[PDB]
């Protein structure tokens, strides 16, 4: 679906959302507005990674600053999982908007 947080349109790649996901997106957006460091403990099970990806991509594409995103995880499998969720999110965004916008999202690992 597609909803609004303040003036920011957020495209969630699922027809349904969790209340923890929505309050999570609200806290991340107000942190991005104030401009400081935040510490967040989402419960596991809920879509923490997809909430991060959805809100941050929406913020980057809607706000005129167009800030880049550095997603740092602890494990190369988790970079893979975040990348897969990012493909799902951007495929949903392409399907909703009718076009594939100018977007570059890449994961980085070693030569091995």
């Amino acid at each position: 679906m597609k909803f609004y947080i303040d003036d920011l349109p957020v495209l969630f790649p699922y027809p349904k959302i969790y209340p923890e996901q929505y309050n999570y997106m609200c806290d991340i957006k107000k942190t991005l507005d104030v401009g400081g460091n935040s510490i967040l403990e989402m419960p596991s099970g809920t879509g923490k990674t997809v909430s991060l990806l959805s809100l941050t991509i929406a913020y980057q594409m809607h706000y005129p600053e167009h800030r880049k995103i550095i997603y740092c995880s602890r494990t190369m499998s988790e970079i893979e999982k975040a990348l897969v969720e990012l493909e799902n999110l951007m495929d949903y965004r392409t399907k909703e908007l009718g076009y594939q916008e100018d977007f570059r999202g890449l994961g980085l690992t070693s030569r091995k």
């Binding site: 027809p15 969790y18 893979e80 969720e85 690992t109």
Partner: protein
Amino acid sequence: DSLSKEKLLTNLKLQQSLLKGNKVLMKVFQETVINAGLPPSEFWSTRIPLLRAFALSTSQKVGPYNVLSTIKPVNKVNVNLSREKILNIFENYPIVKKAYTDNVPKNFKEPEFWARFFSSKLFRKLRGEKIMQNDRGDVIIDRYLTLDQEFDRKDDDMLLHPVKKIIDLDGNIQDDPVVRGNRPDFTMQPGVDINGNSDGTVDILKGMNRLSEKMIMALKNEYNDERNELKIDDLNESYKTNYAIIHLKRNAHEKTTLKVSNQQMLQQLSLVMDNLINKLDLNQVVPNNEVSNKINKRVITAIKINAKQAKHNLEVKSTLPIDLLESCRMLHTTCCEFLKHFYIHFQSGEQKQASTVKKLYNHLKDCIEKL
């Protein structure tokens, strides 16, 4: 595959084994296929499900399991070794099969071979118990330890395949190749002896991991996914049932092989009204001694008919002697078999088998003459 109808029809040995196993099929197979000349393919075409049941009764096998772990002793200790059990050792440990093949028809026999193997160190190492040097083992079987390690390396050769990046822990640790932090303390490495060599505790972990991988890989025989596996099924739409709905028309045709007026209907109704008001003489129900006789005659004829019908209704006893009884029973059995085959070939509606239809009609005429 081998479960198809033509394979079950052409499988002569399986038909013969089911026929030996079954006893009531003697009295059907014996005088129809042999004495009466019915084709065996025609006989088994109607009994394909019985053939398939006897096929699947023996074709299926018990799945793999840690049979050496199920085997435990119970001074004298005794263990029970069935054929399916020792065959389970045979597939789950091919090294024991290689030990069987070159030893049991050449040098020494099965029970003393199994005693040597169960007293050897190879049984302990395959079971996963930690091997120590003070045990004797067995001199004949312990020479296969190096061969079993060679087979373990060979098993690791086709077990080792690249995995997905979701579970690629080697990629997870090689993501930083030049990381050179503190070496973790001795609780994080495998245990070591006094000389620093490995104590063999990791070897039994490798053995049980390889055992489980072998069990799972034995299931894999002739007998975009990352998006699906990371998708949250709870957040998606609930499943919508696509069951068909039917609307039935009740306008059926009427069954096929003096309209009274409202005025006379009201007249008859008012007649009933006054006849109910004036007097309802219940003593008028008594018949006039002739219609009651006719009614009782009709009722007792119906009772006699129903009593003769349902006086009598495991088969019931017969006035025939027993020899003629099974003679008539087997003749009726081949009657019904020939009739069934004739009707199947008659209603198949294929011109290519009209010769078989004619042969079955001649069989039916000979059956009539035999009756």
